[PDB]
Amino acid sequence: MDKRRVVVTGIGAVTPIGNDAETSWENAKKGVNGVAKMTRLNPDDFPVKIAAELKDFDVEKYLEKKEARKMDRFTHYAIASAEMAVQDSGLVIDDSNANRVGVWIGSGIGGMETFETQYEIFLNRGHRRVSPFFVPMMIPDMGSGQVSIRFGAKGINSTTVTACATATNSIGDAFKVIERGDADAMITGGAEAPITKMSLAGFTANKALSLNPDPETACRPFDKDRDGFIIGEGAGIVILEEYEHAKARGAKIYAEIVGYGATGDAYHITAPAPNGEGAARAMKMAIDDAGLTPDKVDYINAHGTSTPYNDEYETQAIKTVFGEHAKKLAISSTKSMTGHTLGASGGIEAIFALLTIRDNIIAPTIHLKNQDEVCDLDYVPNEAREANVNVVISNSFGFGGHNATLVFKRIED
Incomplete structure (x- = not known):
């Protein structure tokens, strides 16, 4: 086994400080705060009043209204980030190489908002009403499933679910696929839409979240006064690519x-x-x-x-x-x-x-x-x-x- 070298040729992200990776990073260097008063849910209804939300994200830049309704928010983020990453990389996935391009995108809790909505329908209107697309929409691998279909990627199609480490494991796992010669490129990372009433109820019951309502001081990593994490949402995807393959096509290489x-x-x-x-x-x-x-x-x-x-x-x-x-x-x-x-x-x-x-x-x-x-x-x-x-x-x-x-x-x- 002669280990292959693996490089990053594409990036894509939607985050609480930008709806693309470059804007997010420009804002990061500027020390921009993405935590603010919560709007996704009514802060009056919860002990936690703040969150890091995507600002003005527009899923219609990626999907028609009909398609988007058949996907949970976490999958919207995976799709948008994957699209930006594939476009950024300049990689062309076609019949000649589709078998060598795979997808490894994780989500920690998957389609929580979809389960809430669909369960309430079940309780109120019964089982018949439940959407035919409920199960696919909710499961965490729907990010990988939808991204594979969207880009025609026919290599390994997998999803690692490891909570906070989800995307880190997923990228490492995809790295190992290429290293051992089982793919030439991988669309990989993680996506999460955890700002939902049940998610908040859970993390709050677990005493995991800061109850500090001031967006200016709540999240302070390594500070003496830190008292818990602040929930955020988004996705980050990279294109990993075997080195010789990247060089042959003249890909830009991030690292x-x-x-x-x-x-x-x-x-x-x-x-x-x-x-x-x-x-x-x-x-x-x-x-x-x-x-x-x-x-x-x-x-x-x-x-x-x-x-x-x-x-x-x-x-x-x-x-x-x-x-x-x-x-x-x-x-x-x-x-x-x-x-x-x-x-x-x-x-x-x-x-x-x-x-x-x-x-x-x-x-x-x-x-x-x-x-x-x-x-x-x-x-x-x-x-x-x-x-x-x-x-x-x-x-x-x-x-x-x-x-x-x-x-x-x-x-x-």
Whole structure:
């Protein structure tokens, strides 16, 4: 097995700070806050009053009204992001190569809004009324299913569901498909539309969400006063592509994907393991996969949920893996701006990590005002920073004990 090299040739995203990847990243560098008073639901009806919503997203740029009604919102986001990514990549999928192009897009909770709506119909009007398209619309693999059909991609069509790590695992899994020679390109990432009444009820019952109603201070990763995550929505998709294939067609290359690590806490269903034990192993595995020593990493895009346990445990895991180098590298949580997008977070964040390499500029952790005595590394608080960044990692340490890290490196043939 001669491992193939794999590069990123296309990006696409819809996020609370932009309806395309470039606008999202331009806003990230500017420290734009995507958290605001909730509008998707009536904030009077919930203990949580804020959320990070897509602003003015227009699904009709992608789908006719008839088609869109047959898809949950999370699938709208997957479709729009995949479309922008495929277009961005310039990759042409036709009869000659369709078998070699696959799809690996995850969602953490899938079509929650559809289940709510359809269940209420069931209760009120009975079983006959339930839509023929209920099951497909709700299941988390409908992102992959619809994207495969839309672009004619006939290679592996799969979906990984790992909560917060959903998109990070999905991209790594797609990376491994190409690495072992089983595809030449993969449309991959994650998509989530979790701003629904049941989703909020659940995370609130679990005490996972900050109840701070001030959009200006609620989400503050690594801050001494952080008290829980802020829910967000969106999707991030990349086109992964075998290196020779990309070069042959003259593809633009964002970076090489070089490492994938994934481990389990085996600790608790919602609480992360003390000291970031599992997270540490995931990062170490990812850099080992890339054949890099820890000192090679320049930037970590942190899971950065803004929970008391996560941000501290993640800091501890970083110290564990990077030792003397932990204080030398730079870290940021862009969740400080996008909120926690759940399953889609790894996709959005991989894109930010990639564009950090392109622009040699690191997006800030915003709202970092009160230094935590335990979280004492360099979080690039408040303002963007110019830095020579050649190697980046992106962390997702999700509920369910799912740990995943990806490593990207500046392209050098």
